[PDB]
A = this chain, B = another copy of it.
Amino acid sequence: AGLLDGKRILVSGIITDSSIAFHIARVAQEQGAQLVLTGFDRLRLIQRITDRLPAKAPLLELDVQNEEHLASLAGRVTEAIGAGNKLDGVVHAIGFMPQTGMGINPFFDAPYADVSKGIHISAYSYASMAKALLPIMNPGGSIVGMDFDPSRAMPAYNWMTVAKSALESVNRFVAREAGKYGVRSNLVAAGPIRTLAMSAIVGGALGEEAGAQIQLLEEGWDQRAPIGWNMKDATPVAKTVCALLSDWLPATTGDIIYADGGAHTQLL
């Protein structure tokens, strides 16, 4: 067994043992996968976290906002995974929005320059990463991004929700391109998870009201979710992406998979 046996998945995200990426990576590895990692800013730190993973995995720098990193991605991955080999999976657990477009700050009040690098890192990054790595994929490969239902306005999230709405719209376009390589591109829309930086926001982080608005949003969930919703266990979201990086969901691409306890489907 090993759902993901002898597969090469490259994982994005992992910033702390709290990060979802981290949890996919573990579940992934127990499942027989073989990762290669991408780090962003504090590489030495990611490095140290990455060591508690059930298995060693090469880590590589990558600021999704720097061309030369992207220019050189593919080389690097091969160079590591070893030539004559290609990868079967790529996971985009990444996003970011500046103080302003999120939190307490009124909505109309975010600078388009701020709003922008959010879009640049949260949505557009999906395309860059795919155009860059699509050339090294075995057929029947999988590309996956982490989503958060932006289909109805919620409060406090503001422009991060707008950035996700774009994510949803970019994925459809990547599905089109990946199609030619016989590779799939999909989004897993998670329920709220207590990641670190989430934690910080439900604390005083972005504001008081902002915070109390999450708290509540966070509770609507478990209520609504017919099978409930644990905001502290990213394991169910990890096993889904794990289903998607696998060959058991072969006829589905442009798609979004609600890994949310059912919440999105119930009114109250």
Where the two chains meet, the residues of A that have a C-beta atom closer than 8 Å to any C-beta of B are 106-109, 112, 115-116, 119-120, 123-124, 127-128, 130-131, 150, 152-153, 155, 158, 161-162, 164-166, 168-170, 172-177, 254
Contact = CB atoms under 8 A, between A and B. Distances in A.
A108 B130 contact: yes
Contacts of A130: 108
Given A107-B177, A123-B162, A153-B176, 6 more contacts: A106-B177, A119-B166, A155-B176, A161-B169, A162-B170, A166-B166
Interface centre among A124, A131, A168 (most CB of B within 10 A): A124
A161 B173 CA distance: 9
How many chain copies does the complex carry? Answer: 2
A108 to B, nearest CB: 3
B127 A120 contact: no
A254 B165 CA distance: 15
A153 B172 contact: yes
Contacts of A108: 127-128, 130-131, 177
Contacts of A109: 131
Nearest to A159: B173
Given A120-B112, A127-B107, A169 B162 contact: yes
Given A162-B169, A166-B169, A112 B131 contact: no
A107 B176 contact: yes
B124 A115 contact: yes
Shortest 6 CB-CB contacts between residues of A and residues of B: A165-B169, A108-B131, A153-B172, A162-B169, A166-B166, A107-B173
Given A166-B162, A173-B158, A120 B131 contact: no
Contacts of A164: 169
B152 A172 contact: yes
